[PDB]
Design a protein around this ligand. Structure first.
Ligand SMILES: O=C(O)Cc1c[nH]c2ccccc12
Ligand SMILES: O=C(O)Cc1c[nH]c2ccccc12
Lengths: 104, 102
C-alpha cells in the first residue's frame, strides 16, 4: 500500500506521464515529433538522450572498453554501472529488441 | 564555426535523430513504455509530464502566474522560457497543440 498523500501525488504524476506519452505517440503519427521534442526537451537534454543510446548500444555490443566509454561517450564507472543496472532491470523483451535494432 | 565544431555538431544531430527513430520504432512495437523507463530517470519523466501541463496552461491563457507557480512549480523564468519555445515552434505544431491540449 501507500499513504494517501504519496498515492495522490503518484497518481497525478502517472496521469501526467501518460498524457506526455500519448501526446508524443500522436505527434509521431502526424509527423510533428521533431518540433514537439524540440519544445519539450532542452538542447543539452536531447544530446544526453542521443549519448545514452550510444552507451546502451556499446554496453550491449560488449566491445568498447571502460576507458573508451569514458573518453568517447563521457561515461565513467558510476554511469556505466547505472546503465548496466537499467538494462538488467528492463524486461527481457526490450533487451532482445534493442539488440536487434541497435546491433543490426 | 570551425570544421571540428561543425563535425561534432553534425554527429550530435545524427545521434539525436537515432534516438528519435528508435523511439518511433518502439511505439510501433508497443515497447515505448519500457524504453522510456530505460532512457529517462524518474525525475526526468516527471519533468516532462509537468512541461506538458505548462505548455497547455500557457496556450489556454487562463491560469495566472501565481497559479502556474503553485500548481505546476513554474516560476517566472520558466514561464518566459516556455513561452519562447512555443513562439519559436512551427505553426503546425502550435495549431495541433491547441487542438489536442485544449
Ligand atoms: O526551460 C526549462 O526549464 C525546461 C523546459 C523545456 N521545455 C519546456 C516547456 C515548458 C516549460 C519548461 C520547459
Ligand atoms: O543514470 C544516468 O546518469 C542517466 C541515464 C538514464 N538512462 C541511462 C542509460 C544509459 C546511461 C545513462 C543513463
Amino acid at each position: 500500500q501507500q499513504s494517501p498523500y504519496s498515492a495522490a501525488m503518484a497518481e497525478q504524476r502517472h496521469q501526467e506521464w501518460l498524457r506526455f506519452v500519448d501526446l508524443l505517440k500522436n505527434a509521431y503519427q502526424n509527423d510533428l515529433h521533431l518540433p514537439l521534442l524540440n519544445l519539450m526537451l532542452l538542447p543539452d537534454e536531447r544530446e544526453a538522450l542521443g549519448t545514452r543510446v550510444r552507451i546502451v548500444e556499446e554496453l550491449l555490443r560488449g566491445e568498447m572498453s571502460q576507458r573508451e566509454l569514458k573518453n568517447e561517450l563521457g561515461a565513467g564507472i558510476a554511469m556505466i554501472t547505472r546503465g548496466s543496472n537499467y538494462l538488467k532491470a528492463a524486461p527481457v523483451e526490450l533487451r532482445q529488441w534493442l539488440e536487434e535494432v541497435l546491433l543490426k
